[PDB]
Amino acid sequence: AIRETVGVDGTPLVYSVTGDPDARALVLLHGWAQSSKCWGPGVLDELAARYRVIAVDLRGHGYSGAPDTGYDDSAVWAGDVDAVLTAEGVTSGAVLLGWSYGGLVICDYLASNGTSAVDGVVLVGAITSIGRGEAGGKVGAAMRAAIPGAMSEEPREAIRALGAFGNALTGPPEGKGAQSQALFGASLTTPPRVRAALFNRSASHDDLLRSLDVPVLVLHGTEDSVVDVSAGRHAAELIPQARASFWEGCDHGPFVEDPERFVKEVGEFVDNL
Amino acid sequence: AIRETVGVDGTPLVYSVTGDPDARALVLLHGWAQSSKCWGPGVLDELAARYRVIAVDLRGHGYSGAPDTGYDDSAVWAGDVDAVLTAEGVTSGAVLLGWSYGGLVICDYLASNGTSAVDGVVLVGAITSIGGEAGGKVGAAMRAAIPGAMSEEPREAIRALGAFGNALTGPPEGKGAQSQALFGASLTTPPRVRAALFNRSASHDDLLRSLDVPVLVLHGTEDSVVDVSAGRHAAELIPQARASFWEGCDHGPFVEDPERFVKEVGEFVDNLG
């Protein structure tokens, strides 16, 4: 299951592969300060019964390399998605699913490489742009409160600031306490300098979204406190072939809040390509 | 650098390899609720310049499989070490370095397999037994954390794990990213795994008295996690023990003074010829 490839700058990239090698590739791109573990074991098992699941550790995250520079270069991010697809020999049919920051990683890839390797995109609580005035980068109250404390090298300041997200990634944590802990833990294992580097950039992919020639599922919680639901509304409006699924009452982690509904909606989208 | 093998029960075991493949094998076994990332990049770089560094994720930890049962079986732990050595073709010359719980993993392996593949052992802040066991004597910070630190409920577990404070780093000035990462790794370890590691008994004083290779006991005199008495006990029972008691140090000597740690480990390993 564990694999390694290399980015265009020589950075090692770790990812995991499960499911039938002959099935459709479903590439999972996680959020800021997370890892390939963020999806629950239950959701990965359900997806692996139907697709060839490729769960990447972003550069600076999980077991991937953490270089000093390059996090602000859309071409470097594109190169990372390309390297994983190339390593798995995925040249067509892929579905790229991006949670949170993972939406921006997908859009960097599509902006450099186009859509020839992909049949579909799923944006989960995603940003698709980043910077001042970007509707597709619109952050919620919890992310606004965590900056810049969550980027601190001083541990008490970072723990307090990351801890300020509360139950945003899980929803009500009843029966999910191990997931709650693991998602908080992954944020703290991400180097502060990486947390900072991912946000010290600007990029607009509004015109990329308007140009997409593949179907996109926009899945977003209406009470997302991390990436405002307006960011998902923005992407659904610009993408020519978007299907929106706005989960009433859900915060930032739909795959944790309702793993059954997440797998059903992602599966119905993918199965209908 | 990343690879994987399988334990005697089918559990996947992830580890990483760095350094000259023709150099002496140095196997790193981490502590309770940690991972192969615990050692710190500077320490791993310095060791990789000298040795063939094999850094394991224990079962239940890091990217290794986390099965429900097996953690109270000395034979299963023995089989995990054997699996890694076998996968890497290490049949002689190895030094096993165990931090904290890693020392008990090493003792399980030596009790099943004997010493033919190893030329030396390093016990760093280590337990060697668990359960009136002088080699399993808990320090005051670990005694206070049981059972809060194994709680499924995230507020309780975050508090109890966070209350270890500087136990793993010492004064954290200039080490804030390491402080965050070590706290984070503990939270990423499932609560059920944190509990299962301690729900067992193993008695290895017989094994310590029988050892026929050099052992460096390196232990802080103010270790709040594993009482320095456990190290003094190992150093007394092991026929070829030598001891380095770091005055004032807590549980993370490789974090408190990475230069001293590499010097002392390197001198030990370099004089096994």
From TrEMBL, chain A:
Repeat keyword on record: no
Keyword terms of this UniProt record: Hydrolase, Oxidoreductase, Peroxidase
Coiled-coil segments on the chain, per record: none
GO annotations of cellular component type: membrane
Entry-linked InterPro entries: AB_hydrolase_1 (IPR000073), AB_hydrolase_fold (IPR029058), AB_hydrolase_sf (IPR050266)
Gene Ontology MF term list: hydrolase activity; peroxidase activity
Transmembrane segments: none
Annotated EC: 1.11.1.-
Stretches assigned to the AB hydrolase-1 domain: 26-264
Pfam families: Abhydrolase_6
Name used for this protein in its record: Non-heme haloperoxidase
The species this protein was found in: Rhodococcus opacus (Nocardia opaca)
Automatic annotation (TrEMBL), chain B:
Gene3D superfamilies hit by this protein: alpha/beta hydrolase
Any one GO CC term of the record: membrane
EC supergroup of this enzyme: oxidoreductase
Molecular function as annotated in GO: hydrolase activity; peroxidase activity
Keywords assigned: Hydrolase, Oxidoreductase, Peroxidase
Annotated ranges, domain AB hydrolase-1: 26-263
InterPro entries (alphabetical): AB_hydrolase_1 (IPR000073), AB_hydrolase_fold (IPR029058), AB_hydrolase_sf (IPR050266)
Entry protein name: Non-heme haloperoxidase
EC number(s) on file: 1.11.1.-
Cell membrane as UniProt keyword: no
Domain of life of the native organism: Bacteria
